[PDB]
């Protein structure tokens, strides 16, 4: 399914992610900008922070207790559509989802 990553400078990158893959693994595996994914995707860090496009936020299953806690420490501005992309598993219902990546993760 298609997933678009817009960077801080305004660059756009489109990937074809299969089902079961988290947006963090797809971004790190394709050298996408700024996303680090240091903890490995276990919601124990905040370097995979992204802003899900307002039109897809209700198509993704909300953050759990661990992600809400880690989102309280993101270095970039915290928006109401902010999510640790390692928690978003790709499905064909999210085809075309767009997420903006903040240039500050650490």
């Amino acid at each position: 399914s298609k997933v678009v990553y817009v960077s801080h400078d305004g660059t756009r990158r489109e990937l074809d992610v299969a089902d079961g893959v988290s947006l963090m693994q797809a971004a790190v595996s394709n050298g996408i900008y700024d996303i680090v994914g240091d903890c490995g995707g276990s919601a124990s860090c905040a370097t995979c922070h992204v802003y899900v496009n307002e039109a897809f936020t209700d198509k993704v299953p909300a953050a759990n207790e661990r992600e809400i806690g880690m989102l309280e420490s993101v270095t970039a501005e915290l928006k109401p559509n902010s999510r640790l992309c390692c928690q978003i598993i790709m499905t064909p219902e999210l085809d075309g989802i767009v997420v903006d990546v903040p240039d500050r993760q650490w």
Binding site: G31, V36, D38, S42, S44, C45, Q105, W106
Partner: protein, 404 residues
């Protein structure tokens, strides 16, 4: 054996020695797996090495590494004295604070440095293997497992290769001590080597990893010479005693299984899936935490100050996590393991490790597709914070190899 403490019940005692397990001759992963036999409880107490708890199942090991409020990383090694002397810097800390040091360490061993070293890692792997190809034999631990990943780290840290046998000795006393040095003496000797190099690189900062850590910032402020020394010490041990040991466990298995060698030669794009399955079957790290207060965990009462060894190698070997855990299946659908750690201390150099493992398997099978253990040789392993292989003599017909 240390005298059983009065809050530990007699029925939870299992004297397992992590530096010299009783079944080490059958394989160190097999030696640690005796803790998972039907008759052993999920959490036991061993009177060996001063006395400490051991979580034997993945559920308990993952849960303890997630809860840093009860299990602290302040004292993580197991002669109660090595854990107290341990003070490297994204590990001896609990995470409000520990988090700011992980970003600086990521700058020197994370993906951004793997991309800077991509060409040199591929060139050294091909050069070391092509030089061995026509010999038809080699001592894998000294001819490749040590020089490949240690020379790349010395290049990444800007240190001269002539210092490898002094550093490799200090790092090995902190994981598998032979008795000549305590953990504190080896750690202070490693700091003694880094102190004058960190001050020189703070005056003239260059491009190597020690210059970046010594002149780096943590959450907007500049790191102190002491913090840089405690972080550089951890990078040296991780660069000289982790992939070096895992490469030998993996090559020993491939040498003893020609069906697995054929699977990767026929389909080389399965090597990074095979690398993960080998990381699970041949996991080799086992440190732990200390209780911050009295706490009942899975029906057992732990006391403040108690040390509990949460061995990362046991989670992937647990049958409750993977069926037929001792069998290596490159196609295993769910390869679950904590080989690179679990919780907020996840390995920061796992990307450099995966790259060195995958480049070694692909470039070795391309030049030397068929090889076996030297005839008559019985491979011996060693245990400690990081397990390893004492020696791995391999042989092959140089008429079946091919120069690229």
């Amino acid at each position: 054996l240390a005298p059983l403490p009065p809050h530990v019940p007699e029925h939870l005692v299992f004297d397992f020695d992590m530096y010299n397990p009783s079944n080490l001759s059958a394989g160190v992963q097999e030696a640690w797996a005796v803790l998972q036999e039907s008759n052993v409880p999920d959490l036991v107490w061993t009177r060996c090495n001063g006395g400490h708890w051991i979580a034997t199942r993945g559920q308990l090991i993952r849960e303890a590494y997630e809860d840093y409020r009860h299990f602290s990383s302040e004292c993580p090694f197991i002669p109660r004295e090595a854990g107290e002397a341990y003070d490297f810097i994204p590990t001896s800390m609990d995470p409000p604070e520990q988090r700011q040091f992980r970003a600086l360490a990521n700058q020197v061993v994370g993906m951004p440095v793997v991309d800077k070293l991509e060409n040199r890692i591929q060139e050294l792997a091909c050069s070391l293997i092509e030089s061995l190809r026509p010999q038809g034999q080699c001592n894998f631990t000294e001819d490749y497992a040590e020089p490949f990943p240690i020379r790349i780290f010395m290049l990444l840290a800007g240190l001269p290769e002539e210092d490898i046998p002094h550093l490799k000795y200090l790092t090995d006393q902190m994981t598998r001590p032979d008795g000549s040095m305590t953990f504190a003496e080896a750690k202070e000797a490693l700091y003694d080597y880094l102190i004058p190099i960190i001050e020189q690189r703070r005056q003239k900062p260059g491009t190597d990893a020690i210059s970046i850590v010594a002149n780096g910032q943590v959450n907007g402020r500049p790191i102190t010479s002491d913090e840089a020394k405690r972080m550089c010490g951890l990078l040296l041990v991780g660069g000289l005693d982790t992939v070096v040991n895992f490469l030998s466990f993996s090559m020993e298995f491939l040498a003893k299984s020609p069906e697995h060698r054929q699977e990767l030669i026929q389909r080389p794009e399965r090597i990074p899936a095979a690398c993960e399955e080998l990381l699970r079957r041949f996991s080799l790290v086992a440190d732990g935490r200390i209780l911050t207060s009295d706490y009942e965990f899975h029906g057992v009462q732990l006391k403040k100050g108690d040390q509990i060894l949460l061995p990362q190698m046991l989670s992937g070997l647990d049958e409750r996590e993977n069926a037929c855990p001792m069998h290596v299946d490159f196609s295993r659908q769910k390869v679950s393991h904590t080989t690179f750690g679990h919780g907020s201390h996840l390995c920061l150099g796992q990307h450099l490790a995966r790259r060195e493992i995958i480049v070694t398997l692909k470039e070795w099978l391309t030049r030397i597709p068929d090889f076996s253990i030297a005839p008559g040789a019985q491979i011996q392993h060693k245990s400690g914070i990081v397990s390893g292989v004492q020696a791995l003599p391999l042989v092959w017909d140089p008429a079946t190899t091919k120069a690229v």
